């Protein structure tokens, strides 16, 4: 805003008639813009008019802040709910991961005992078969019964 | 004072330099008291504090929205990183769960066979057992060897 100082320098400038027509025209513009945008607004401005204006800015700012707050809050919640989900999911998977983890070797080293049981027996059979063939020339009908059991098949 | 354009009709009186300088000095004498009145009204304590008040209100509001936006873009980043981690851990547990699962599917089926083989063999042994009890009325030394094998530890 043109301080009373600066305005008066312009009015003494324009006083002199032999001032250039580029500086006279420039100096009255200065006074045109200056009056244009603010002087003119203070032609009406009542202490009440601009109290309401100031108050309305205030309302508008809080309304704007509040809407922003609303938005941010909804976003944070949604990120939070995804983390909760994933966590109900981390819980559950590492549960079954462990529930599978040795049910697997409950059943597995169950097995490697049922293996050497199989091998225990298989070896009894291999030795019986041996004996059988040491005495195969005898045509022993009982031995033949036994031999026929050994090589009998439905594995 | 001067309507927005009893002002403007005088910025053009002054424009023509051939105005007499006894009514160039009047048209400026009026512009000068106008401004006198204007500045003392612009300078009014209530109106000036209201001017400052409004200015400072917009500033603080801008400062505050900025702080709120930042607090928000930091949160979302931090929550972002937690969410991605929980997904890469999710995928890791998914792999681990099913690989344990697929191994017990292969190893479960793998021993219902081995069992079948065991029972097959035990059956044979039981068969051979029954024959040895039929013929221990004669007592072959060969049979005794077979019996000895049946009951070994």
Swiss-Prot record, chain A:
Source species, domain of life: Eukaryota
Subcellular location: Cytoplasm, Myofibril; Cytoplasm, Myofibril, Sarcomere
Swiss-Prot/TrEMBL domain comment: The rodlike tail sequence is highly repetitive, showing cycles of a 28-residue repeat pattern composed of 4 heptapeptides, characteristic for alpha-helical coiled coils. Limited proteolysis of myosin heavy chain produces 1 light meromyosin (LMM) and 1 heavy meromyosin (HMM). HMM can be further cleaved into 2 globular subfragments (S1) and 1 rod-shaped subfragment (S2).
Oligomer status and interactors: Muscle myosin is a hexameric protein that consists of 2 heavy chain subunits (MHC), 2 alkali light chain subunits (MLC) and 2 regulatory light chain subunits (MLC-2). Interacts with ECPAS. Interacts (via C-terminus) with LRRC39.
Function description: Myosins are actin-based motor molecules with ATPase activity essential for muscle contraction. Forms regular bipolar thick filaments that, together with actin thin filaments, constitute the fundamental contractile unit of skeletal and cardiac muscle.
Additional facts recorded: The cardiac alpha isoform is a 'fast' ATPase myosin, while the beta isoform is a 'slow' ATPase.
Disease: Cardiomyopathy, familial hypertrophic, 1: A hereditary heart disorder characterized by ventricular hypertrophy, which is usually asymmetric and often involves the interventricular septum. The symptoms include dyspnea, syncope, collapse, palpitations, and chest pain. They can be readily provoked by exercise. The disorder has inter- and intrafamilial variability ranging from benign to malignant forms with high risk of cardiac failure and sudden cardiac death. Congenital myopathy 7A, myosin storage, autosomal dominant: A skeletal muscle disorder characterized by prominent axial and proximal weakening, spinal stiffness, severe scoliosis, with or without respiratory and cardiac involvement. The age at symptom onset can range from early childhood to late adulthood, and disease severity ranges from asymptomatic to severe muscular weakness and respiratory insufficiency. Histopathological examination shows variable findings including subsarcolemmal hyaline bodies in type 1 fibers.
Family: Belongs to the TRAFAC class myosin-kinesin ATPase superfamily. Myosin family.
Listed name of the protein: Myosin-7
Native source species: Homo sapiens (Human)
């Amino acid at each position: 805003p043109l301080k009373p100082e600066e305005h008066e320098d312009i009015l003494n400038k324009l006083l002199d008639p032999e001032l250039a027509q580029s500086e006279r025209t420039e100096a009255l513009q200065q006074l045109r813009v200056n009056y244009g945008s603010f002087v003119s607004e203070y032609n009406d401005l009542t202490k009440s008019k601009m109290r309401r204006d100031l108050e309305e800015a205030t309302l508008q700012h809080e309304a704007t802040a509040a809407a922003l707050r609303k938005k941010h809050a909804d976003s944070v919640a949604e990120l939070g709910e995804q983390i909760d989900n994933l966590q109900r999911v981390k819980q559950k998977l590492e549960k079954e991961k462990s529930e599978f983890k040795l049910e697997l070797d409950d059943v597995t080293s169950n097995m490697e005992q049922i293996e050497k049981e199989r091998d225990f027996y298989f070896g009894k059979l291999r030795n019986i078969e041996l004996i059988c063939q040491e005495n195969e020339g005898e045509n022993d009908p009982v031995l033949q019964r036994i031999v026929d059991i050994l090589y009998a098949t439905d594995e």
